[PDB]
Amino acid sequence: DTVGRPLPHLAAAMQASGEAVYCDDIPRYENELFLRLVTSTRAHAKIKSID
Amino acid sequence: DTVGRPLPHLAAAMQASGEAVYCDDIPRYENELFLRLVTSTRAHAKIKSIDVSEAQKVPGFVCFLSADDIPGSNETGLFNDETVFAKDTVTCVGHIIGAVVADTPEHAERAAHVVKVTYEDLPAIITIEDAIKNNSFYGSELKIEKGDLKKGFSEADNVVSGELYIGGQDHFYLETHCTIAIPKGEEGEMELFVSTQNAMKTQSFVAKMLGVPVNRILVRVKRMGGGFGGKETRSTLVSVAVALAAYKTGHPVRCMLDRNEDMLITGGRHPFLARYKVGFMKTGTIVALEVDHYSNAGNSRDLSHSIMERALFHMDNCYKIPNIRGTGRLCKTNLSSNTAFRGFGGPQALFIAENWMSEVAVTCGLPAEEVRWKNMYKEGDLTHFNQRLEGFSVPRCWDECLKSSQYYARKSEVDKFNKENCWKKRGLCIIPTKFGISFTVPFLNQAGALIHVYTDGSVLVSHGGTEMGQGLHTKMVQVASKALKIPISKIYISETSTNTVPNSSPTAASVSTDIYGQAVYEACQTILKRLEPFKKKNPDGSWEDWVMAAYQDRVSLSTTGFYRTPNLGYSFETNSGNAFHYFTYGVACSEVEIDCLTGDHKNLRTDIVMDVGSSLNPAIDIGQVEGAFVQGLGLFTLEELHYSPEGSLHTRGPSTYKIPAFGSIPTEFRVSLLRDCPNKKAIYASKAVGEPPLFLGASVFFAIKDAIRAARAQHTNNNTKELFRLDSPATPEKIRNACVDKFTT
Amino acid sequence: YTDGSVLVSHGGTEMGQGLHTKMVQVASKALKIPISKIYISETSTNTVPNSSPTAASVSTDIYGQAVYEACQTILKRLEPFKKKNPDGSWEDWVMAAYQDRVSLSTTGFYRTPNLGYSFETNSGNAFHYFTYGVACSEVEIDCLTGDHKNL
Amino acid sequence: TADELVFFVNGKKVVEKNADPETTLLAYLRRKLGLRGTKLGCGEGGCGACTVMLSKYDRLQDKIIHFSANACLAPICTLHHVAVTTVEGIGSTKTRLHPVQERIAKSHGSQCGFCTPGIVMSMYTLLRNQPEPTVEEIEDAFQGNLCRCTGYRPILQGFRTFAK
Amino acid sequence: TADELVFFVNGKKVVEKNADPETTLLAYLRRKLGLRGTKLGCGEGGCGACTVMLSKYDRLQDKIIHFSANACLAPICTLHHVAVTTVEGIGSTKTRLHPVQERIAKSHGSQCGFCTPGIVMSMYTLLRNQPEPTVEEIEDAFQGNLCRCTGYRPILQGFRTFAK
Amino acid sequence: PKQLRFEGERVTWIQASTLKELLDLKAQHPEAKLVVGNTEIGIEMKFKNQLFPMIICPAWIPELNAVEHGPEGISFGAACALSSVEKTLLEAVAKLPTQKTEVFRGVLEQLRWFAGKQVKSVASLGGNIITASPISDLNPVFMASGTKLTIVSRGTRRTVPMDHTFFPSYRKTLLGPEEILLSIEIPYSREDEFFSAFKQASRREDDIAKVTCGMRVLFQPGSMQVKELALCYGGMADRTISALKTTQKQLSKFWNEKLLQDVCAGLAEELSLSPDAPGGMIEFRRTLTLSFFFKFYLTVLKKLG
Ligand SMILES: Cc1cc2nc3c(=O)[nH]c(=O)nc-3n(C[C@H](O)[C@H](O)[C@H](O)COP(=O)(O)OP(=O)(O)OC[C@H]3O[C@@H](n4cnc5c(N)ncnc54)[C@H](O)[C@@H]3O)c2cc1C
Ligand SMILES: Nc1nc2c(c(=O)[nH]1)N[C@H]1C(S)=C(S)[C@@H](COP(=O)(O)O)O[C@H]1N2
Ligand SMILES: Sc1ncnc2[nH]cnc12
Ligand code: MOS
Ligand code: MOS
Ligand code: FES
Ligand code: FES
Ligand code: FES
Ligand code: FES
């Protein structure tokens, strides 16, 4: 019964060792590709061409 | 509402385009490694050394694994009498000793072949005969007994006795065993993609071997390219081996077996020896029966006890027999452990019954259909294990089969053909069957489901059962659609997983549609109830409207569902309480022509009438009848496993093991489902279909025997009332030799 | 599961606030078993559908409650076994419920009561309750540079 | 000091610069090119789960010939200037199914589905050589194809629709 | 016509035959060697999420030196005969945690956990240079490490246990 | 269209474009292996465990692919696929009179339930012959008919009819180490010449104990008196054998009940197996050798009187 006791965060040890998995830490498939967003450089405008 | 309509299997289109994913079709991780088992070449020996220096020279080699590398427990199997990896002593030819891990499956194969093992041989037990004389059994005698045996025999006009053997069978699922294991690196967590019928035990066995709570392990199963019982327990041999490799290396690991490895390692159906004695009257009426069954179980227990139980429960077929003792024993041998295979001991006991029956007909000199019919149960009779037969529909099935096969007319033709032909003969036989529906283990008859409805009104269903081609998911989607009253296109099932439905029984015993159908049905009702108030508020809106108002009003759209089969629990003392929920019935008639000079035969025609109550899907069901039957025709005529004197298997591929082919099947093949016979006891009045039909293939076996008799009457002796021994499978060697003539002699 | 270990899943996500840690502490007190017997793995749309975003500080309140209801349902189904074998362990009770075909899986759900403020009428509760606090701070500024220390 | 191997898979050019003589076609399609339609059933030529269609211009005969073949035994090194067609080459649920695929599906000729790609490629080879075959030619095109689920009736019944 | 690059990562030899001068160490650890302890926070040297320890024998000084560095800016090409230590190199829950890892974990100095490997490597570098530091040296070892969850107090309180 | 080289971890493969290129290569490398369809070599490398570091592929060579129609019979290049041979033979049979196609109809029979189209499209004729399986369905037919083999090397070239001496021991043929099989001539049958072929249905062990046979009889002009007799069997020994001693005794005799008796006595006796012969099925096999002849005996009669 631990309710009310200063129990450390359950993943703390593995965050400190680098073993806890975040999203980009997941291994890639052999055919896995990558994406990069292309973004506006204007506040407000008509797009007249993309090359 | 599609219940009762011939809807094609939901994945069929994607199966025909190559787009459906099986286990090895899943892409690999960049760092993904490959495993190959290292296996014994001895029946029975001490391991004296293991040398890996040559395997180390192979490019891509990563490591060898053995019993020492295991952090948890090297104790495994259904009764805990198996090792994951053998330690000091091997106990059959395919016994697992270790494994090799490499960077390609080509490299794995090359490294495994080159591992040197040194043995010191120990004396071995291979045959059933060997096991009896050395007294080599698991557990103690099983028995069922009714009436008075002395007295039965003392009032019999006649007696007949003998011995019968029935060979085993390899599953030959087109897709072999297969596991992927992915280690997370946190807290022992592991996710596995596996070709199995038993995601539950896969999860248990992996966690035990690892030394880790069951809640760390996720097992996921999308589909199997065939199971037939061989994936109910024996898939854990590959599964646990692969898990350990992922644990130890820290990388994803996989393994798919080659055929030759699968047939040696993973087990087949139990061979059976029978010793029998029947007492009967001049009329052909049976009056007393006694049978001792011995099965060849191999080097562990596995399912062998349950298989013996179902056999004893089936030693009567469709025949009333007032005085009866059946016993059973399990032979402990140095061969790969045998296991479940479609029928589960039922076809073996059923085959033994029809054999003495055919000998009663010949000894009395009466026609067979007549002797079989005089002896049938009638509506309301009790069986040798004191269960009542209700809605017993074999008499109907029999009657319609005789009529639509034109049995008596075609019988004349056969005699005619036999009077005019010298070195070719024809045979014609007709056979009944009954099959009990339920796991003989009361606690496995439970099932759970989990349903979510999302805010677009689309529905995700998940239940404890797996797809192996039998169309289970197709059927559950039909069920849900009828229960919720929305089209099937709104409902989807994706996979079977231990984190959506826990503690589930293997997909087996033919009961899956019954039990998961029921659990899915309960989850639907709960959803309907919760949606009811919104339907009342907007009677003229659509499904999507009611779902979205329930959501905005904070009513939950997720629920479990559960079912537990009622009133099950047979006792081996007392000899009472129900062992089965109900029975499935059918009748088959087959005709063959043999070549007396070569042993070859042709399957001219087969007619089947099968009782499946009101079918949920006639097309799936007729498909299940044809498949099962053709596998039975394989068991009794084509398929044969053959070992060396030292206990090593010779038959290891399609070129030495012949399963039925396109031209194996009967030129005229006809199946009807019986009409107007609803089953009160199961979902939407349907009945289990998977295993009950397989035994009907024996009708081809007994048509062949009938044709050997006429060949024998031609060339050998004048004793019509002569008995000869014919074992299963009736290969061409057995058929030719039995046709004794001026050449055999 | 049949070994007596428990897998908990709920609509909330971990982002460093310790939500999972707290749910595990809740489950453990509710079931009366040590925390080492309970595990949470991840958050997924195939286990808990239609969830609100983890936000507004209420996640502990609302998922705690839902986890709590699931535990009660489990304790009720396990109650007859505990009576048959009052001196056995958690493990024994789990296995006898399993072998007697009583389900060991359940949902749980919670709906905050008496909420609904109206911009017309200017009434009904907008919040369930209020959280309160007080802070005192002292700084030193350098009037020539704009720089400051927090003392 | 090593020649390039150049062949075609589903109409697309493959230039293998480092062919290994031991590499099977089956292994190349699954593990190098990522086309998992074609399946491993036995590795010894008896089951047909691995059936593909091969096409080449016959320098002798003068014609283009189409014949079926077991990918598990075909060395990639016998395939310089050969064209390969796999199950994913003739139709797809993403675009449109070929009639061979449609008919087997809708006739209940597929259950577990593992042998279906191979049977589909045997029927399709037969059609490309002979657009209107006899019932007899149909039964025969399948001697090297095994199926453990269906008992065969529904597959023949569905394909017999292509005859006379 | 191109030289091999040779370096060490966690006591193990790496022989790079085709080094590209544009390749960062951060990218090489994560994507080439599969060690994801070390994290991408900004790519421009301000956050320390990517902090590692570098060790070399200084041909001038005569000594071995240990200093911390940003993996996101270090070109692998500056690293010939350099030793890299990452968070996975000092301790693990699979074997045993280094005291640096233990104290931060148990002091509640890790919440979301993304900055913890980099803070761990800054403290560890300081300890290998000075086994018994002052409170002042401790506070100072962290000017290049940002944390958004904890407000810092518990990390300093935990690490101040190594002082005097 | 030139010669290509492929280099592997263990194997070098040369695709020969020309007859010359091949004979040069087989001379420089006598131990090298010829691969056409791979339906045997592939099996030996995966299962029976062999490694052959040097392979040569002759498929591209014309000659070895050639199909020629002479006065004596039909000639097939050694690399011709089994389905080409089948296709060509079906055509000759639908077009020439019956009395000329008895050997052809035998070959077509052995080829009936012999694997599927996939295998028959790549399996080469020369491959089945040189592999020399004790259970090969084609060698017994070829032997009983004296089908002619053209064997060639840099320098040498010879044409021998196939007889019992062509298979000296388990899995070997009477070719020199530098030699290749170039082409195979299947004969027309003459007047008073009759032929049959048979094979045991299933099969149980790898390359032993499956009875398969070729049978040939030649009569004196317009009569029923034997001039030549040939009965060759597979699956009875560790190679294709002929029943010389038995058939020799029937020369000059007439085709009747008593001839039937003596060949059966002769067969039972010449081909007998010890009870521990590899492959088992001892009585079945013996029964087949007699039974197959009984069928031949009747088929000949129906084709005469
Ligand atoms: C599933 C299946 C079923 C089969 N069924 C039967 C059957 O029913 N009856 C039967 O008899 N066989 C059967 N076989 C054997 C099969 O027919 C042979 O594999 C085939 O004919 C050999 O041809 P290949 O070109 O593929 O030989 P390869 O594997 O390429 O080589 C075979 C051997 O012949 C040699 N060789 C090839 N060409 C020449 C040349 N011209 N000169 C000198 N040596 C040469 C090679 O060096 C090699 O040793 C079967 C095989 C399989 C795969
Ligand atoms: N196509 C196909 N049908 C099959 C099988 C299979 O593996 N493939 N297994 C059989 C066996 S052994 C059983 S127990 C039932 C199991 O599924 P069910 O309970 O849904 O019938 O399917 C039967 N029919
Ligand atoms: S009865 C029966 N049939 C099939 N599988 C089983 N497993 C356990 N009991 C069984
Ligand atoms: O009960 Mo099916 O797995 S034999
Ligand atoms: O309500 Mo917190 O997610 S901003
Ligand atoms: S995989 Fe069985 S034939 Fe190729
Ligand atoms: S459908 Fe399962 S093998 Fe054909
Ligand atoms: S990533 Fe922020 S400093 Fe390297
Ligand atoms: S713990 Fe979240 S950034 Fe430091």
CSV table of N, CA and C and ligand atoms in Angstrom, one decimal, chain E residues 110-115 147-150, ligand 9:
chain,number,residue,atom,x,y,z
E,110,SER,N,14.4,13.2,-12.5
E,110,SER,CA,14.0,12.8,-13.8
E,110,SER,C,12.5,12.7,-13.9
E,111,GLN,N,11.9,13.5,-14.8
E,111,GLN,CA,10.4,13.4,-15.0
E,111,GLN,C,10.1,12.8,-16.4
E,112,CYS,N,10.1,13.6,-17.4
E,112,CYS,CA,9.9,13.0,-18.7
E,112,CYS,C,11.1,12.2,-19.2
E,113,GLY,N,12.2,12.5,-18.6
E,113,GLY,CA,13.4,11.8,-18.9
E,113,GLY,C,14.3,12.0,-20.1
E,114,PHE,N,13.9,12.9,-21.0
E,114,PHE,CA,14.7,13.1,-22.3
E,114,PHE,C,16.0,13.8,-22.1
E,115,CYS,N,16.2,14.7,-21.1
E,115,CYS,CA,17.4,15.4,-20.9
E,115,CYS,C,18.3,14.6,-19.9
E,147,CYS,N,16.7,21.6,-18.9
E,147,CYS,CA,15.6,20.7,-18.4
E,147,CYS,C,14.3,21.5,-18.3
E,148,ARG,N,13.3,21.0,-18.9
E,148,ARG,CA,12.0,21.7,-18.9
E,148,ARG,C,10.9,21.2,-17.9
E,149,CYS,N,11.2,20.1,-17.3
E,149,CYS,CA,10.2,19.5,-16.4
E,149,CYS,C,10.4,19.8,-14.9
E,150,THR,N,11.7,19.7,-14.4
E,150,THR,CA,12.0,19.6,-13.0
E,150,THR,C,12.2,20.9,-12.1
G,9,FES,S1,13.0,15.7,-17.4
G,9,FES,FE1,11.8,16.5,-19.0
G,9,FES,S2,13.5,17.7,-19.8
G,9,FES,FE2,14.5,17.1,-18.0
